[PDB]
């Protein structure tokens, strides 16, 4: 629209890519999400439908440890949708994998983030349904926000009831990999342990490059502890917590925040 000049791109997530966007006139860029309809169809809820709830989602999001929507270009003549956030120029905080992780203390904070976002979705009622290092963007101020809602979901009462699957494989919890439909927010909670692993291992806890073998490491290998970087016990219990295969047992949110490693 009028007021933008789209330069390069910058990053790209579940759907669409993400551009840099720079205001001439107000001396200032944003991160602007591009949507091209035609491109939508090819990749019951459909296309077209499952952007505006995403932007349903978008517009009610307001903590600062998740991005903030400023508007939304939306002409019905054009073909392209376009999606205009506040930019958070580092990006994001790790992509795995990767030689150098960060420290114990570090990790914990950005853990504490993560949670903070976390408890506000799920006090709103949406699940991420993708949470990983790559969809966690550095703020200037250290803090990192949760970016990229394509396949998150409004739900009703305590917990969104869910079917299929959605999101990266690696961070789905083995409950979703089927049959009997299962909980949102313990979806989330095993995405954020496995991000918690990536923290400060650099690489994930279950790895494979064919989906079959990542499927079976996931529903039956327990975590393994490398000796190398060490790590705290208190840490390795919480991680043991969240990565917890019966979703009954895991951790909840509320008692991740009591934990003497997030809290001490
Ligand atoms: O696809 C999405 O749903 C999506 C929507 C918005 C943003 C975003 C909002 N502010 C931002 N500031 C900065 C950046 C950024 C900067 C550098 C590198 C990568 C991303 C991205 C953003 C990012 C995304 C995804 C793209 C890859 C990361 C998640
Ligand atoms: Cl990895």
Same mark, same amino acid.
């Given at each position: 629209?009028?007021?933008?000049?789209?330069?390069?791109?910058?990053?790209?997530?579940?759907?669409?890519?993400?551009?840099?966007?720079?205001?001439?006139?107000?001396?200032?860029?944003?991160?602007?999400?591009?949507?091209?309809?035609?491109?939508?169809?090819?990749?019951?809820?459909?296309?077209? *439908?499952?952007?505006?709830? +995403?932007?349903?989602?978008?517009?009610? $999001?307001? &903590? #600062?440890?998740?991005?903030?929507?400023?508007?939304?270009?939306?002409?019905? /003549?054009?073909? @392209?949708?376009?999606?205009?956030?506040?930019?958070?120029?580092?990006?994001?905080?790790?992509?795995?994998?990767?030689?150098?992780?960060?420290?114990? *203390?570090?990790?914990?904070?950005?853990?504490?983030?993560?949670?903070?976002?976390?408890?506000?979705? &799920?006090?709103?009622?949406?699940?991420?349904?993708?949470?990983?290092?790559?969809?966690?963007?550095?703020?200037?101020?250290? &803090?990192?926000?949760? !970016?990229?809602?394509? #396949?998150? @979901?409004?739900?009703?009462?305590?917990?969104?009831?869910?079917?299929?699957?959605?999101?990266?494989?690696?961070?789905?919890?083995? +409950? !979703?990999?089927?049959?009997?439909?299962?909980?949102?927010? /313990?979806?989330? %909670?095993? /995405?954020?342990?496995?991000? $918690?692993?990536?923290?400060?291992?650099?690489?994930?806890?279950?790895?494979?490059?064919?989906?079959?073998?990542?499927?079976?490491?996931?529903?039956?290998?327990? #975590? #393994?502890?490398? *000796?190398?970087?060490?790590?705290?016990?208190?840490?390795?219990? $919480?991680?043991?917590?969240?990565?917890?295969?019966?979703?009954?047992?895991?951790?909840? %949110?509320?008692?991740?925040?009591?934990?003497?490693?997030?809290?001490?």
């Amino acid at each position: 629209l009028n007021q933008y000049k789209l330069q390069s791109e910058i990053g790209k997530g579940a759907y669409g890519v993400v551009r840099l966007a720079y205001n001439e006139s107000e001396d200032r860029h944003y991160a602007m999400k591009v949507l091209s309809k035609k491109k939508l169809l090819k990749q019951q809820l459909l296309p077209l *439908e499952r952007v505006y709830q +995403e932007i349903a989602i978008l517009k009610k $999001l307001d &903590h #600062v440890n998740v991005v903030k929507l400023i508007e939304v270009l939306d002409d019905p /003549a054009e073909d @392209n949708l376009y999606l205009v956030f506040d930019l958070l120029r580092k990006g994001p905080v790790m992509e795995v994998p990767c030689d150098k992780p960060f420290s114990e *203390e570090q990790a914990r904070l950005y853990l504490r983030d993560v949670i903070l976002g976390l408890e506000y979705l &799920h006090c709103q009622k949406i699940v991420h349904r993708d949470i990983k290092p790559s969809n966690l963007l550095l703020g200037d101020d250290g &803090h990192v926000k949760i !970016a990229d809602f394509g #396949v998150s @979901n409004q739900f009703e009462g305590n917990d969104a009831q869910l079917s299929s699957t959605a999101g990266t494989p690696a961070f789905m919890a083995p +409950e !979703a990999i089927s049959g009997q439909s299962f909980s949102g927010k /313990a979806l989330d %909670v095993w /995405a954020t342990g496995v991000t $918690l692993y990536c923290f400060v291992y650099g690489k994930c806890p279950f790895i494979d490059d064919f989906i079959l073998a990542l499927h079976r490491k996931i529903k039956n290998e327990p #975590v #393994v502890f490398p *000796e190398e970087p060490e790590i705290s016990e208190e840490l390795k219990d $919480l991680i043991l917590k969240m990565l917890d295969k019966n979703p009954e047992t895991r951790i909840g %949110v509320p008692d991740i925040k009591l934990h003497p490693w997030v809290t001490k």
